[PDB]
DNA sequence: TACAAAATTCCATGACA
DNA sequence: ATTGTCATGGAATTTTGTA
DNA sequence: TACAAAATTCCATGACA
DNA sequence: ATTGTCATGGAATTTTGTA
C-alpha cells in the first residue's frame, strides 16, 4: 500500500531519493552502497525482526547484521529494538552490562552495645562435637565473642545469646536472613528483652561486612595456629577471641579491647598511657577517642553505573539457579528507593520485597 | 600513686550449694575491685576444675592483674596457683576467718547474697535462668558513692537497661 | 655490655641525644614524646619481636604498636619486617596484596585448523543418557563442535574427534589438564595424527579462554530456547552448534561460518556480497578478510601489580585447600620467565611446575 | 549467471550393502558438487530414516541449497521430502537408469568406490574405522582441473595432511 | 633552613560470605 | 523493610635529628 | 559548508570456567 | 613447558541526506 508510491518515484518520510526504488519478482528492492535489499512491506517487519533474532536469540547488532544481509528500511535498529525489549527469554537469562552504584559506608555506631553483627561460620571439621561459630562483633568497637556450636540453629543462638547479654543489652542485632535469625522463635527472644532485630537484604553478605570482615580474621588466625597440627579448633576460640579483641587496628591505632573498656586488661603488652589519669580523666579520653575515629568515605562511582529510580523496570537475581536455567527473575517495578543502593521492589507476584540493588539489574530496552 | 583501674583486681567468692537448678548448685562471683562490675558462673562445685573452667571463660575478655580470694581449698590448690602463673595474675589471699575485700566489694557481695534470696525463694530451682537478668541488675545499680553504676563506669556510656 | 655506654652519656650511632636514658628496676629507660619506653639489650629483641608477633600473627604496624606499648630501640620496624619474612605461617596464611600484570592477548592464530581448544561443559542434567559436551573451538574462526558424551573421559574425546578429524587436521589442540587430555591414551591418539598437544598452566581457565567463553554462549543459547520447557538439551545441540556458528560477532563483522568457507550455506538470512565472484576471486577475499581481524592489546597495568623476575621467591597457590588450611603453599624460586605472565617454578620439592602468575603471589618480605 | 560455489549442490547416494564393521553395513555419500568435498557417514540401511539422521549432522555445519540423488526410495519418499522443505533444501531427482551429475563429481564418486575396494580387501570387516582415513585422502586429493583439492576450494588454504 | 633516613600514612588488593 | 569491611605491605609522604 | 538524526563504533561489564 | 575472551546495550563518535 505506503509500498506502491515508491516506484512512482514520490516522496516518503523515511525512504531517501536519490536512490531508485524498483520492482523485481513482486518484491520491491532498493540499490544501496552495501548492495541492492529488500524493502518488506511495514506488516512484515516485525515478522521478519523476529525470525532474524530467533535464530540465536542475538542482540542489537548481531541481529541487525542478520537482517542487513537481505532487507532495508527506515530505521532497522528501531524496529530491532522493540523486539528485544519484548523477547521474555532474552531478558531473563542475559547478563546485566552495567554495575550497581557505588557502596555507602554507614556511619559507624555511636557507642558500644548500641548494634550487634551476628553470623554463624561453619560447618567447620568436627571438633568436640562441634561444627559451627556463633560470631558476635559490636558495630562500634568491633569487639567480639565466639561461640562453638553443633548447628546454625536458633536454640544455638539462644542459649549462647542469653551468656553474653547477661553483660549488657544491645539496642539493635543486625544478621543475614539465615534460617536461625528469621524464626519467629528469635524474635520472641529479642522483643522479650527490648532489642531491635533488622536483617540484610537477601543473599547480600556486603550488608554484614562488620562479621563477615571479622570471620576471614578468625578463620586466619585459626589457620595459622593449626599449621602441621590436626584441626582442633574448639580449644583455640577462647585464645583466638582474646587475641583478636587485643589486635590493634593499624587505621584506627587502637583494639577492640581499648575501645570497649578504655583501658587493656592483663594482657602481653599492654598499653600504660593512662597510668595517671583516673578512671573519670580516662573515660572522657575514651568518649573523645570514640567520636574521632577514621569514617572511610565513598568510592567514585564506575564510568557505567547505574541508580534505581521509582517507577524503572528492575530485574531481581535468581538466588540458586538450577542448571540451564535463567539466572534473572521477569521484571518488576521499584516501588521505593530506600537509599541509593537499597530498594524495594513489586515482585514475583506480587509481595513488596527489600533487596540490594547489586542483586538487581534494570531492565534493557 | 596509681589511681584504681578495671582489672586491677578481680574478688572471686563461692556462693552454694544451692537447690539444683539445671543440675548446677554453686555460684562461682567475680567482683572488679573498682568498678564494683560482677560475673557469675555457675558451676557444679567448689572446685579449682569448676574455678578454672569458668575463669577461662572470663579471661577470654580480660585478665585481672590481681585476684583476691579467701582461703577456700579451691583457690589455695597448685592447679589453680599453676593456672594464674600461666596467665601472669597475681594470687592473693586474705588471711583465714579474717576475710578482708575492699567496703565497695562487701556492699555489692552483700546486695548479691540478697537479691540470690529475695528470687531463690518462690523458685528456689529456677535460678540459673535468672543469672543473666540478675547480673544486669546488679551492674546496673546506682553506687551512692560516685553515682556511677559498674556497666558506666566499665564501659564509659549510659546502658540500654537502666534500673 | 652496649647498653653500659649510654648511662654514661657517651653516644651509639642509633640513639639520639637529647633524650635521657636512666636506670630503673635494673632496666634500661627512656624518655620520650610518646612516654617512657624500656629498651631491651639487643640479645632480646629477637624474643620480644617474636612474643608481640606471636599473639595474633599480626603484620607490620599491628606488631610494632604492641611492642611499641613498653619498648624503644633504633630501627624497630626493621626487626619486625624480619620476624614477618620468617613466619613459616603468616608466609602460607595471608593473602597477597599485589595484582598480576595485565593479561597477554595471544596472537589470533593465522588459519583455520592451526589451532583447535577443547573443553567439556557439565555434568548437564541427564538428556537420553547423556550428561556432557565436548567443545572443540577453532581458534582462527570460532567455529564450534559440540559432541554430546556420558562422561568427560578420553574414549569419549577420542571417539568425537575421530568424527571430527575426518573432516581436517589440527596442527595444535589445547586443552586445560583435565584428566580425559592429559591421558597417555590420548597422547598417542594425538602423535599417531602429528596433532601437537599444548596444555594450560594448571588451574588457570583464562588461558582457554577461548573455548570457555564459548561454552557460556552454548549455555545461555540453551537456556533460552529451554524456559518453561524440561531440559531436553540432547536434541537442541546440533541447532546450537547451528546458530552459534552463523551468528555475527559484532566487532569482527563476521560469523565462525563465514570466517571458515568464505561464504554461507543455505541458512535464514545468508549474506549474497559475493555471489558475482568466482569462488577463486571469492576465497581471496576471504584470505584478506582473514589477516585484516581486530585484535585486542594487552590493558594498562594497574597500580601496583608485579612481574616475576628470574631467582625471586614466589608461592604457588593451594588448589583444593582443606577447611582451616593454608591457601598458599611454600615459597619457591622463578627458574625461567617463559613470559611475563607465565612462569616455570621449582616447587615442593624439588620438580618443575610450568604455572600462571595470577596462581603465584611474590613472596613478602 | 552466478558462478558455481560450496553448498550450492550437494549429490548423495548410498553404497553397499558392505561387510559388517561395528555393525552397519552401508556409506551414504555426500559430495560437493561444485569443490568435490566428500562427507562419508555409516548406516544400518540404506533408509530414510539413516538417511535423514546421517543428514541431520551434516546439515548443522552446512545446509546445501540443493541436494541431488537417484531416485532410490530412500530419497523419493515424502518423509524425506518434508525434512528438506522443513530446512528449505530444494530436492532434485536424476531421471531412473539415467543417474547423471557434474563430471567433476562422477570421477569423483569413482575414486570413492575404488579407493574402499583397494581397503575393503584385506580387512573387509575393519571398513569403519578407515571411514575418517578414506575422506581425508579424497578431500586432499589433487583435481587435474583446477589443481587444487577439495579442501583447498571449501576453506581456502592448505591442509596439514596432503597427498 | 636544609638534608637523608626513619617513621608514619596512604591505599589497592583480596577475602569474609 | 535498609546500608560493605579492613589487615596487609610496598610506595608516598611527613617527621625527625642534626646542622 | 552546516545542520539533526541515524548509523556505526566504542567499550565497561560480567560470565565461561 | 606457555598466553583470556567476547556478546551486550547505552553513550560517543562519525556518517548521511539534504541544504
Ligand atoms: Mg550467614
Ligand atoms: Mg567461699
Ligand atoms: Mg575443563
Ligand atoms: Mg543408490
Ligand atoms: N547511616
Ligand atoms: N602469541
Ligand atoms: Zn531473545
Ligand atoms: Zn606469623
Given at each position: 500500500?505506503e509500498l506502491?508510491?515508491l ?5 516518503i518520510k523515511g525512504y531517501p531519493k536519490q536512490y531508485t526504488y524498483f520492482?523485481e519478482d513482486?518484491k520491491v528492492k532498493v540499490s544501496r552502497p552495501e548492495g541492492v535489499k529488500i524493502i518488506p512491506p511495514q506488516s512484515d517487519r516485525q515478522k521478519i525482526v523476529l525470525q532474524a533474532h530467533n535464530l540465536a536469540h542475538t542482540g542489537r547488532e548481531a541481529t541487525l547484521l542478520k537482517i542487513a544481509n537481505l532487507y532495508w528500511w527506515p530505521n532497522m535498529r528501531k524496529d530491532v529494538v522493540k523486539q528485544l525489549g519484548r523477547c521474555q527469554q532474552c531478558l531473563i537469562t542475559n547478563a546485566s552490562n552495567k554495575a550497581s552504584g ?199 562511582a564506575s564510568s557505567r553505573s547505574w541508580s534505581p529510580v521509582?517507577?524503572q523496570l528492575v530485574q531481581e537475581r535468581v538466588?540458586?539457579p538450577?542448571?540451564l536455567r535463567p539466572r534473572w527473575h521477569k521484571p518488576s517495578?521499584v ?22 540493588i547489586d542483586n538487581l539489574k534494570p531492565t534493557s530496552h | ?163
Amino acid at each position: 500500500a505506503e509500498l506502491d508510491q515508491l516506484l512512482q518515484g514520490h516522496y516518503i518520510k523515511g525512504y531517501p531519493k536519490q536512490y531508485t526504488y524498483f520492482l523485481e519478482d513482486g518484491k520491491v528492492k532498493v540499490s544501496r552502497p552495501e548492495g541492492v535489499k529488500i524493502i518488506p512491506p511495514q506488516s512484515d517487519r516485525q515478522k521478519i525482526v523476529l525470525q532474524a533474532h530467533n535464530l540465536a536469540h542475538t542482540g542489537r547488532e548481531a541481529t541487525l547484521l542478520k537482517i542487513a544481509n537481505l532487507y532495508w528500511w527506515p530505521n532497522m535498529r528501531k524496529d530491532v529494538v522493540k523486539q528485544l525489549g519484548r523477547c521474555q527469554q532474552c531478558l531473563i537469562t542475559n547478563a546485566s552490562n552495567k554495575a550497581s552504584g557505588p557502596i555507602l559506608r554507614p556511619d559507624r555506631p555511636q557507642k558500644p552495645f548500641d548494634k550487634f553483627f551476628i553470623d554463624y561460620i561453619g560447618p567447620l571439621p568436627p571438633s568436640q562435637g562441634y561444627l559451627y561459630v556463633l560470631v558476635v562483633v559490636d558495630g562500634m568497637t568491633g569487639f567480639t565473642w565466639l561461640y562453638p556450636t553443633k548447628a546454625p540453629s536458633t536454640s544455638a543462638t539462644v542459649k549462647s545469646l542469653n551468656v553474653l547479654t547477661s553483660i549488657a543489652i544491645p539496642k539493635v542485632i543486625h544478621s543475614d536472613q539465615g534460617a536461625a535469625f528469621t524464626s519467629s522463635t528469635f524474635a520472641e527472644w529479642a522483643k522479650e528483652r527490648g532489642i531491635h532485630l533488622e536483617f540484610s537484604t537477601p543473599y547480600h553478605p556486603q550488608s554484614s561486612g562488620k562479621v563477615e570482615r571479622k570471620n576471614s580474621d578468625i578463620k586466619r588466625l585459626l589457620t595459622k595456629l593449626l599449621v602441621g597440627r590436626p584441626t582442633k579448633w574448639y580449644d583455640l576460640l577462647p585464645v583466638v577471641q582474646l587475641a583478636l579483641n587485643n589486635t590493634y587496628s593499624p587505621v584506627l591505632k587502637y583494639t577492640p579491647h581499648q575501645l570497649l573498656f578504655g583501658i587493656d586488661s592483663n594482657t602481653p603488652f599492654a598499653n600504660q598511657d593512662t597510668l595517671d589519669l583516673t578512671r573519670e580523666e580516662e573515660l572522657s579520653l575514651l568518649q573523645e577517642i570514640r567520636t574521632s575515629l577514621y569514617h572511610p568515605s565513598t568510592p567514585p562511582a564506575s564510568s557505567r553505573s547505574w541508580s534505581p529510580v521509582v517507577g524503572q523496570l528492575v530485574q531481581e537475581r535468581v538466588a540458586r539457579p538450577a542448571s540451564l536455567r535463567p539466572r534473572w527473575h521477569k521484571p518488576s517495578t521499584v516501588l521505593k528507593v530506600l537509599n541509593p543502593r537499597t530498594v524495594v521492589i513489586l515482585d514475583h507476584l506480587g509481595n513488596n520485597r527489600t533487596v540490594s540493588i547489586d542483586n538487581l539489574k534494570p531492565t534493557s530496552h | 600513686d596509681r589511681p584504681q583501674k578495671p582489672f586491677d583486681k578481680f574478688f572471686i567468692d563461692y556462693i552454694g550449694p544451692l537447690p539444683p537448678s539445671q543440675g548446677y548448685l554453686y555460684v562461682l562471683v567475680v567482683v572488679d575491685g573498682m568498678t564494683g562490675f560482677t560475673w557469675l558462673y555457675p558451676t557444679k562445685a567448689p572446685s579449682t576444675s569448676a574455678t578454672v573452667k569458668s575463669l577461662n571463660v572470663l579471661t577470654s575478655i580480660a585478665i585481672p592483674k590481681v585476684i583476691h580470694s579467701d582461703q577456700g581449698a579451691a583457690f589455695t590448690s597448685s592447679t589453680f596457683a599453676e593456672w594464674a602463673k600461666e596467665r601472669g595474675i597475681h594470687l592473693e589471699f586474705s588471711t583465714p576467718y579474717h576475710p578482708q575485700s575492699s567496703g565497695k566489694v562487701e556492699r555489692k557481695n552483700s546486695d548479691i547474697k540478697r537479691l540470690l534470696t529475695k528470687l531463690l525463694v518462690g523458685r528456689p530451682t529456677k535460678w540459673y535462668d535468672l543469672l543473666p537478668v540478675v547480673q544486669l541488675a546488679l551492674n546496673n545499680t546506682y553506687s551512692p558513692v560516685l553515682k556511677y553504676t559498674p556497666h558506666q563506669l566499665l564501659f564509659g556510656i549510659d546502658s540500654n537497661t537502666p534500673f
